[PDB]
Amino acid sequence: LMGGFGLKHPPPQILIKNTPVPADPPTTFNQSKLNSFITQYSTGQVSVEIEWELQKENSKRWNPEIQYTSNYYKSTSVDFAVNTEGVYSEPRPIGTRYLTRNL
Amino acid sequence: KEVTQNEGTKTIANNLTSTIQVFTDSEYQLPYVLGSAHQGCLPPFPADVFMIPQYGYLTLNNGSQAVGRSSFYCLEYFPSQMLRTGNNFQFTYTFEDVPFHSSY
């Protein structure tokens, strides 16, 4: 309902965790689980590749269609770009449905 | 045939070198107007002679006005066969699987 493709078998969840590294244990045995750990974080890069299959338009419509277009006139900043402060923003929502087809 | 009208006297003669154009919308690119129960089908009685219906179509409207998505089609922007007297046209079509109608 929110939109999208519904799959019985969707891309699987990928779960990541830092393995625990204990701080020094006591020198005489205690059965309680360890609660003292070294403090850690991790950083890395991640890549996703997707192949999409397209369906081309086959229209016999004579006149031009509606198209998404960037604004013609001057503006303080560029839409879909950064700030003077380095903040990316997306100005509007963009849908998918510009071309037309008969029923 | 060409019809000539002078002085209230009208005459009909053949125009041998004239053509007609035919095409099928095999790719379903024109608005499909069959299926709306219109007049102009072939007559039930074989002996009857019939007149071919005019083709027209509709698109989106707001009141009497067009909207952005309104579409215009020119049928001359399709390939068509041209036939003179002595030429003919034919085609073959296969129905997709469809359930039997229940005559019961």
Short mmCIF file of C-alpha atoms in Angstrom, two decimals:
data_model
loop_
_atom_site.label_atom_id
_atom_site.label_comp_id
_atom_site.label_asym_id
_atom_site.label_seq_id
_atom_site.Cartn_x
_atom_site.Cartn_y
_atom_site.Cartn_z
CA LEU A 1 0.00 0.00 0.00
CA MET A 2 2.80 2.43 0.59
CA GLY A 3 3.87 1.58 -2.92
CA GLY A 4 6.40 -0.67 -4.52
CA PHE A 5 6.81 -4.28 -5.42
CA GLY A 6 5.56 -6.99 -3.22
CA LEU A 7 7.62 -10.09 -3.00
CA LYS A 8 7.16 -13.41 -1.29
CA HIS A 9 10.91 -13.64 -1.17
CA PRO A 10 12.32 -10.15 -0.93
CA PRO A 11 15.90 -9.15 -0.54
CA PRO A 12 16.96 -10.74 2.71
CA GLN A 13 17.78 -8.83 5.83
CA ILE A 14 21.49 -8.25 6.32
CA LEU A 15 22.57 -8.05 9.92
CA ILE A 16 25.85 -6.74 11.20
CA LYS A 17 27.37 -6.54 14.64
CA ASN A 18 30.65 -5.80 16.31
CA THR A 19 32.00 -8.78 18.13
CA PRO A 20 32.47 -8.23 21.82
CA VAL A 21 35.94 -7.75 23.17
CA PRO A 22 36.26 -8.21 26.86
CA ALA A 23 38.24 -5.95 29.11
CA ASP A 24 40.45 -7.80 31.50
CA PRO A 25 38.73 -10.45 33.49
CA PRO A 26 39.14 -11.07 37.13
CA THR A 27 42.02 -13.18 38.17
CA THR A 28 39.98 -15.69 40.06
CA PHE A 29 37.01 -17.40 38.50
CA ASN A 30 33.56 -15.99 38.68
CA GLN A 31 30.64 -17.59 36.89
CA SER A 32 28.75 -14.45 36.11
CA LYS A 33 28.64 -13.29 32.55
CA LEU A 34 31.14 -10.67 31.68
CA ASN A 35 29.86 -7.14 31.79
CA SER A 36 33.05 -5.22 31.17
CA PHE A 37 33.98 -4.68 27.58
CA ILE A 38 36.34 -2.64 25.53
CA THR A 39 34.68 0.18 23.67
CA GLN A 40 34.49 -0.26 19.95
CA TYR A 41 32.92 0.93 16.75
CA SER A 42 33.51 0.07 13.13
CA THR A 43 33.41 1.81 9.83
CA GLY A 44 33.51 0.55 6.29
CA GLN A 45 31.99 0.85 2.88
CA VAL A 46 29.03 -0.90 1.37
CA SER A 47 28.03 -1.40 -2.23
CA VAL A 48 24.72 -2.25 -3.86
CA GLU A 49 24.13 -3.10 -7.47
CA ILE A 50 20.73 -3.54 -9.01
CA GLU A 51 19.63 -4.39 -12.49
CA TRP A 52 16.34 -2.99 -13.56
CA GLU A 53 14.39 -4.04 -16.57
CA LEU A 54 12.61 -1.38 -18.51
CA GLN A 55 9.50 -1.29 -20.58
CA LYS A 56 9.66 1.10 -23.46
CA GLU A 57 6.95 3.45 -24.64
CA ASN A 58 5.10 2.63 -27.79
CA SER A 59 2.90 5.68 -28.24
CA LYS A 60 1.21 6.86 -31.36
CA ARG A 61 0.25 10.11 -29.76
CA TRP A 62 0.88 13.06 -32.03
CA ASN A 63 1.34 15.85 -29.55
CA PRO A 64 4.00 16.19 -26.92
CA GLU A 65 3.90 14.64 -23.52
CA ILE A 66 4.35 15.95 -20.06
CA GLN A 67 7.85 15.55 -18.72
CA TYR A 68 9.62 16.19 -15.48
CA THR A 69 11.75 19.21 -15.94
CA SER A 70 14.13 21.27 -13.95
CA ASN A 71 13.14 24.88 -13.46
CA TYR A 72 13.92 27.33 -16.21
CA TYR A 73 14.45 30.51 -14.23
CA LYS A 74 17.13 31.73 -11.89
CA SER A 75 17.32 30.62 -8.35
CA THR A 76 19.27 31.08 -5.19
CA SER A 77 20.53 27.55 -5.27
CA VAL A 78 20.27 24.51 -7.49
CA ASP A 79 17.53 22.03 -6.87
CA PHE A 80 18.83 18.63 -5.85
CA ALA A 81 22.22 19.87 -4.81
CA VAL A 82 24.08 21.21 -1.82
CA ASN A 83 23.95 24.30 0.36
CA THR A 84 26.48 26.91 1.09
CA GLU A 85 26.56 24.83 4.20
CA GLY A 86 26.99 21.53 2.45
CA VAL A 87 23.56 20.13 3.04
CA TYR A 88 21.99 18.11 0.32
CA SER A 89 18.28 18.39 0.01
CA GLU A 90 15.53 17.08 -2.17
CA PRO A 91 13.10 19.89 -2.91
CA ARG A 92 10.08 18.03 -4.17
CA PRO A 93 8.78 14.53 -4.43
CA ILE A 94 9.11 13.01 -7.86
CA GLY A 95 6.68 10.44 -9.09
CA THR A 96 6.83 8.12 -11.99
CA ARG A 97 3.96 8.93 -14.23
CA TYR A 98 4.51 11.42 -16.96
CA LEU A 99 3.99 9.54 -20.19
CA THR A 100 0.55 8.46 -21.24
CA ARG A 101 -1.11 5.39 -22.52
CA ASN A 102 -4.69 4.60 -23.50
CA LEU A 103 -6.95 2.46 -21.53
CA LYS B 1 -17.40 5.72 -57.78
CA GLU B 2 -17.63 9.40 -58.44
CA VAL B 3 -20.83 11.33 -58.51
CA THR B 4 -21.39 14.33 -60.68
CA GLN B 5 -24.04 16.89 -59.98
CA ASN B 6 -25.05 19.42 -62.61
CA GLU B 7 -28.35 21.21 -62.93
CA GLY B 8 -30.16 18.96 -60.55
CA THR B 9 -29.27 15.99 -62.68
CA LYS B 10 -26.94 13.64 -60.88
CA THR B 11 -24.88 10.90 -62.42
CA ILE B 12 -22.69 8.15 -61.10
CA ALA B 13 -19.68 6.73 -62.79
CA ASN B 14 -16.73 4.58 -61.91
CA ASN B 15 -13.43 6.11 -61.10
CA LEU B 16 -11.12 3.32 -62.13
CA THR B 17 -7.91 4.80 -60.87
CA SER B 18 -9.20 5.59 -57.41
CA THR B 19 -8.08 3.89 -54.22
CA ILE B 20 -9.31 3.18 -50.75
CA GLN B 21 -7.15 2.63 -47.74
CA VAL B 22 -7.43 -0.12 -45.14
CA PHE B 23 -5.51 -1.01 -42.05
CA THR B 24 -5.82 -3.01 -38.90
CA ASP B 25 -4.85 -1.70 -35.58
CA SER B 26 -2.88 -4.78 -34.83
CA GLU B 27 -0.94 -3.13 -32.06
CA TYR B 28 -3.87 -1.56 -30.27
CA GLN B 29 -2.63 1.99 -30.53
CA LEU B 30 -5.93 3.63 -31.29
CA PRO B 31 -8.79 3.94 -28.90
CA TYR B 32 -10.86 0.79 -29.11
CA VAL B 33 -14.35 1.63 -29.99
CA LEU B 34 -15.81 -1.77 -30.63
CA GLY B 35 -17.27 -3.27 -27.54
CA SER B 36 -19.44 -0.29 -26.74
CA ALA B 37 -22.48 -1.77 -28.46
CA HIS B 38 -22.72 0.56 -31.41
CA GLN B 39 -24.78 0.37 -34.58
CA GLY B 40 -23.23 -0.37 -37.91
CA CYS B 41 -22.36 -4.02 -37.63
CA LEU B 42 -23.00 -6.38 -40.49
CA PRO B 43 -26.67 -7.05 -40.89
CA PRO B 44 -28.31 -10.20 -39.67
CA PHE B 45 -29.88 -10.80 -43.01
CA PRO B 46 -27.32 -11.57 -45.68
CA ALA B 47 -29.27 -9.83 -48.41
CA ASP B 48 -29.20 -6.52 -46.66
CA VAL B 49 -26.74 -3.89 -47.71
CA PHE B 50 -25.08 -1.74 -45.12
CA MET B 51 -23.31 1.49 -44.53
CA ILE B 52 -20.00 1.72 -42.78
CA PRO B 53 -19.89 3.69 -39.57
CA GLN B 54 -17.78 6.72 -38.94
CA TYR B 55 -14.87 6.48 -36.57
CA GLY B 56 -14.44 8.84 -33.66
CA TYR B 57 -12.86 8.70 -30.25
CA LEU B 58 -12.71 10.38 -26.88
CA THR B 59 -10.03 11.51 -24.43
CA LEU B 60 -9.79 13.22 -21.13
CA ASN B 61 -11.84 16.29 -20.59
CA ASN B 62 -12.68 18.89 -18.04
CA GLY B 63 -16.03 20.20 -18.95
CA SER B 64 -15.77 21.01 -22.60
CA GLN B 65 -12.10 21.53 -22.33
CA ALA B 66 -9.07 19.43 -22.88
CA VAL B 67 -6.54 18.75 -20.21
CA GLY B 68 -2.84 18.11 -20.36
CA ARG B 69 -3.13 14.43 -20.96
CA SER B 70 -5.62 14.71 -23.71
CA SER B 71 -4.45 12.91 -26.81
CA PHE B 72 -4.87 13.49 -30.51
CA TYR B 73 -4.57 10.70 -33.05
CA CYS B 74 -4.17 10.88 -36.77
CA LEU B 75 -4.98 7.67 -38.58
CA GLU B 76 -2.88 8.75 -41.49
CA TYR B 77 0.11 8.22 -39.31
CA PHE B 78 -0.29 4.51 -39.68
CA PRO B 79 0.65 2.42 -42.64
CA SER B 80 -2.29 1.35 -44.75
CA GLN B 81 -2.92 -0.71 -47.82
CA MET B 82 -4.16 1.13 -50.85
CA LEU B 83 -6.52 -0.73 -53.13
CA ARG B 84 -7.87 0.02 -56.54
CA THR B 85 -10.68 -1.95 -58.03
CA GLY B 86 -9.16 -5.33 -58.57
CA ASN B 87 -7.09 -5.37 -55.40
CA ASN B 88 -8.11 -7.11 -52.20
CA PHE B 89 -7.24 -7.22 -48.51
CA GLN B 90 -7.09 -10.02 -45.98
CA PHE B 91 -5.93 -11.00 -42.56
CA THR B 92 -6.06 -13.77 -40.03
CA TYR B 93 -6.45 -13.60 -36.27
CA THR B 94 -6.31 -16.11 -33.45
CA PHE B 95 -8.30 -15.74 -30.30
CA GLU B 96 -6.55 -16.05 -26.98
CA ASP B 97 -7.58 -18.74 -24.59
CA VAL B 98 -10.81 -17.74 -23.05
CA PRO B 99 -13.30 -19.67 -20.99
CA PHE B 100 -16.21 -21.33 -22.67
CA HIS B 101 -19.43 -19.46 -22.32
CA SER B 102 -21.91 -21.42 -20.35
CA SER B 103 -24.86 -22.35 -22.43
CA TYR B 104 -26.47 -24.11 -19.57
#
